[model samples]
Target: PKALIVYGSTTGNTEYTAETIARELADAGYEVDSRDAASVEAGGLFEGFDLVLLGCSTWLDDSIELQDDFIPLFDSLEETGAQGRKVACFGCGDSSYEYFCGAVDAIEEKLKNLGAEIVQDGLRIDGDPRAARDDIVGWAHDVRGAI
Candidate 1:
């Protein structure tokens, strides 16, 4: 099996979480492509992958904002071949915020609307993701099981 993980992180928390998930998936004997959203094109992004994982940190402004680098990808998701594809979401955010990890929810909802099969509930991390390593790994394990 194969997996693709794309992350948008400003403080690096989401990136760390993405790497943790990628490592867990690799340990389970899958080929994984982990990428920074800043460098990836949204078009046909999910092609040939058994699973796609997206991660972004939430920024609370006048309204909820996805991490800067992920905005383009999020806007262009329809071109990513997400229809009928297996997908999951995860992200880091401050729980004190009105919409904690809201970026994850936004991405998951969009994927759902695009006809992607959501294999698991999103992994929402509060504060530093390093402290939530176990949760990330556990979520990755569960996602792997769903594949």
Candidate 2:
């Protein structure tokens, strides 16, 4: 299936995760496309893609406003022929904060409740992600299979 990995990165941490997921999906034999959340049209993203993976970095106590802005865009997908499409979420955060990866959960909730099938298990990384890069990729493979 064709997969889209859309990410919003204010500090680069989240982008790294998105890249990893793209590579993992590619290795899993799925056509993968990567897009910057700020630069891409959310409706178009969900159009040709069979799976959507959303990435974000937790900030301001517990949110991904950048991703939140695109939530409404999914409305177009819901109304048209996009129902039952797959979507997943991932994020990176400094665990010192109580809300580490909270943004990931929020993103997941938004997509799941909107008629998008959650095709992958959402992942959260605390601290430097490079150390756990393989794990991220592994999770991506798992999610790809689910999709």
Candidate 3:
């Protein structure tokens, strides 16, 4: 199986989470392609991958917003061939915020609207993702099984 992971992280929390998930998927015998959202293009991004995971930390300005580096990719997601693809979402956020991990919710909603099959509920870390290592790994395992 093949998997793709793209992440946007300012404090490195979501990046760490993405890395952990990638490692888990790799250990499960998947050919994984993981990239930083800042360094990836949106066009045909999900092409040829059996599963795609998107992670972006949430930003609370006047309202919820996706991480800065992920904004461009998120804006162009419709061109990424998401329709009929399998996808999952994850993110790091603070519970103090009114909408924790809102970016994950946003991305999942967009993917659903685009006809992507969401394989699992999004992983939302309330604080530092390092502290949520087990959850991340467990979710990855579940996602692998779902696929």
Candidate 4:
């Protein structure tokens, strides 16, 4: 009953992605929740949830605004037994960018340094994830397995 699909969106794409994930997880009968990165209380995420799916969107070919804030918040939670929890990363980026979803890669490195376990194989969606919904669902299944 402890699982969440957390996301930080910019131009609405990431929110849709997060909602899809939340729906999928709920359909699987897990107690799934979704949070806007801006609305979530810092470090409060540590209180519950064994599985976390983090979604971010590209901003000017870089990290989203909320993620930029959340990163430091996450860093502060580092290595305090709060960071080592299982996590997965996904992002929506334009294929035109040379560093498409580079934010996820950056997050992966930072979270690993913080001692978190990587559950999903980083999911990067170019444009729409409509066709890739199953991929996201698969990632959730992987999370189910890892926990």
Candidate 5:
């Protein structure tokens, strides 16, 4: 199956996570298209892809916010052709933050509202994704199986 991954990252943690997931999916025989959110548009973004993956780190102090580069896409998900598409989300954040990995939750909810089929639960990295390599790999494995 074809897969698309779009990620918005500041310190590169979520980018690295997206890269890792892309590599795993590619190795599992899925044709993968990975893009930085900054380089992608919102409309029909998931066109022709069998699976979609979104990654964005949480920001803000008192409230949850999607990563800067991802906000536009997130806001316009209805135009991305996500309805009835298989989808999943992931992100990196500090659990110490009041809204740890809140961006992931928000994206998942939006995808659900848009009628996207959630293949699996979102992967929320509590710290640097590098330190959570096993979790990332395991989550990828799960998503691969779900597809």
Candidate 6:
């Protein structure tokens, strides 16, 4: 299966998570393409991928905000062929923050609205994602099965 993983991390947490996800999928024999949101083009991004994973750390602010690099992709999700595509979202955030892991929720909702099939519950890391290796790997495994 071909999988696309796109992530935006300001403090490196989500990027690390994205890599871990890619590794697990690759280990499961998937053809994985991991990309940084800053380097990715949103339009038709999901076109030919069997699964698409999106990761973005939530910013602690008055309102829930997606990482700077991911906002463009988030805003243009319809152009990404998300409809009918298998997709999942993940993110890092502080539980102490009012909108903890809110970015994951936002992305998932958007994808659902676009007609994407959500393969798993979003992986929301409360702190350093490296500390949550099992969770990341477990989520990837579930994703692998769903695909």
| Backbone clashes, each candidate | 0, 0, 0, 0, 0, 0
Off by over 4 Å in 6: 62-64
lDDT of 5 by residue, 1-147 (tens): 999999999999999999999999999899999999999988889999999998999896555488889988888899999989999899998888788888989999888988999999999898778889999999999998887
Quality of model 3 by C-alpha lDDT:
0.93
**Model 1 scores what on Cα lDDT?**
0.92
RMSD of 2: 2.9
Rate residue 93 of model 2 by lDDT. Answer: 82
* Poorest 10 consecutive residues by lDDT, candidate 4: 61-70
lDDT of each: 0.92, 0.72, 0.93, 0.72, 0.90, 0.90
lDDT of 2 at 59: 66
Q: List the residue pairs that clash in candidate 5.
A: none
Given candidate 3, what's the lDDT at residue 30? Answer: 94
Per residue, candidate 2 scores C-alpha lDDT tens digits across 1-147 of: 888777777777788888877887787688988877777654445777788787877665333333443444433444433457777788888778877677777766766666778876788898878888988978887886675
1 versus 6: better lDDT goes to: 1
Model 6 has how many clashing residue pairs?
Answer: 0
Candidate number with the higher TM-score (2 or 3): 3
Q: Residues 1-147, candidate 6, lDDT per residue (tens digit)?
A: 899999999888999999999999888899999999999888889999999999999886665489999988999999999888988899899999888899999999989988999999999998877788999999889878877
Over 30-99, each residue of candidate 3 has an lDDT whose tens digit, in order, gives: 9999999999989999999999999999998775398999999999999999999999999999999888
Give me candidate 4's TM-score against the actual structure.
Answer: 0.83
lDDT of 1 by residue, 75-125 (tens): 999999999999999999998988989998999999999999999999998
TM-score of 6: 0.96
